[PDB]
């Protein structure tokens, strides 16, 4: 589990810089957002941003590191239903009974 990023791209990352470029929060330009491979889900230009913040202007600055922390724990994502004992785990999205 890596944490605060900087600037090289933005593949399959967090919902933080989803505003820095409205394109994918009001419209739907992330699919055409790539710089040029569209003629001949997270991603981004080579480098067009700093770190973490609220970008109405720079009203939430935090220029820093990128701590990549490893937690010895198991990561499930699409659990289902095995109703023998009380519902354990979660569903793909619905009842997150936990």
């Amino acid at each position: 589990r890596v944490e605060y990023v900087k600037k090289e791209r933005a593949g399959l990352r967090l919902p933080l810089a989803a505003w820095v470029e409205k394109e994918a929060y009001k419209p739907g330009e992330i699919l055409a957002e790539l710089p040029e491979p569209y003629l001949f889900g997270d991603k981004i230009v080579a480098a067009i941003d700093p770190e973490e913040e609220v970008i109405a202007e720079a009203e939430g600055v935090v220029h820093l590191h990128e701590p990549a922390s490893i937690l010895v724990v198991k990561a499930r994502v699409y659990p289902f239903e095995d109703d023998v004992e009380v519902s354990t785990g979660d569903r793909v999205a619905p009842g997150d009974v936990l």
Partner: protein, 345 residues
């Protein structure tokens, strides 16, 4: 084996293992602390449950089970049933609202990792305020009572750093405890800031005159409403209770306290006077017309001594009447049989 080090150590052990980034991580946790209350504040709305409830129940789901809710504050709420029940409703909240439950929880969790990363931030501060009258620990303890009280209030949006923000509140909390626990006889904050001046002025006068200031030099120096009776009076109070138990005289065995007498307890000659007084006044109680005697009798006697609302029915002029007359007849039938004459008191 001697406390202090353990704690100073235990701190550094999770401090030395969990220090916080000067900005980032602190700013990270922060957002997760504020988005916490904000979240809870909405839970309360969508649930008609008092914030006090959510705050607690969310805390137990993280901090501790039904164990920490029992011994601390009695079973007002069902250690088992009540708590899970509430959580049941929270988890039952649609995606749109449950959103906040997770945020709340993720919120309080952050608080946890923000209060520890500074336990030493307190210690350092405490290092200063020391010999005033509180163990180093307590001084550190009351400092943490301040650290948290400083988190509930920090607004990360206002870019100024946390560490600092904590400083203030921490000193605030330490002082209170100092002014409030320092002595055995509670004195106000008012008459505290005032004693220090006097302790101080006592020195400024030690500075030039040479003669240990009379309650005049000190008075003039201090300020306005400062008389001579004041300063003299201010100090007896600024004193320190002497141990009821302390080596006296040719100090060996003879312990102080045994030199202090008693007063509540009537010594035999008095316990004997209430004896004679009682019966003799009570014998000289009967040779009277109870219609008024028994009213002044019990008056001073029974309850408390107001001539107006004195007697039951009859008006005033009949009070003094039999009063002043019975009293006197009562005074001369005794002049004869001299029983009280030689004042039993």
């Amino acid at each position: 084996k001697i406390s202090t080090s353990d704690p100073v150590r235990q701190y550094l052990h999770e401090i030395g293992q969990v220090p916080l980034l000067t900005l980032e991580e602190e700013v990270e946790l922060a957002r997760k602390v504020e988005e916490g209350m904000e979240a809870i504040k909405k839970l309360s709305e969508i649930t008609g449950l008092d914030p006090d409830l959510i705050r607690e129940v969310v805390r137990a789901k993280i901090l501790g089970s039904a164990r920490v809710r029992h011994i601390p504050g009695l079973k007002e709420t069902l250690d088992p049933k009540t708590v899970e029940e509430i959580d049941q409703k929270l988890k039952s909240l649609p995606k749109e609202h449950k959103r906040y439950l997770h945020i709340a929880r993720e919120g309080e969790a952050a608080r946890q990792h923000l209060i520890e990363a500074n336990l030493r931030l307190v210690v350092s501060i405490a290092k200063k305020y020391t010999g005033r009258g509180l163990s180093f620990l307590d001084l550190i303890q009351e400092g943490n009572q301040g650290l948290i009280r400083a988190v509930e209030k920090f607004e990360y949006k206002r870019r100024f750093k946390f560490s600092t923000y904590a400083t203030w509140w921490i000193r605030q909390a330490i002082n209170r405890a100092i002014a409030d626990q320092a002595r055995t006889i509670r004195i106000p904050v008012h008459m505290v800031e005032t004693i220090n001046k006097l302790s101080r002025t006592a020195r400024q006068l030690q500075q030039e005159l040479g003669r240990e200031p009379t309650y005049e030099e000190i008075a003039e120096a201090m300020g306005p409403g400062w008389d001579a009776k004041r300063v003299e009076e201010t100090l007896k109070i600024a004193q320190e209770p002497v141990s009821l138990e302390t080596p006296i005289g040719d100090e060996k065995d003879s312990f102080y306290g045994d030199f202090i007498p008693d007063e509540h307890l009537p010594s035999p000659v008095d316990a004997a006077t209430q004896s004679l007084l009682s019966e003799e006044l009570e014998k000289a109680l009967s040779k009277l017309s109870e219609r008024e005697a028994m009213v002044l009798k019990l008056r001073k006697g029974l309850i408390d001594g107001e001539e107006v609302g004195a007697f039951f029915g009859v008006t005033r002029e009949r009070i003094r009447q039999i009063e002043n007359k019975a009293l006197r007849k009562l005074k001369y039938h005794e002049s004869r049989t001299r029983k009280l004459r030689d004042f039993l008191d």
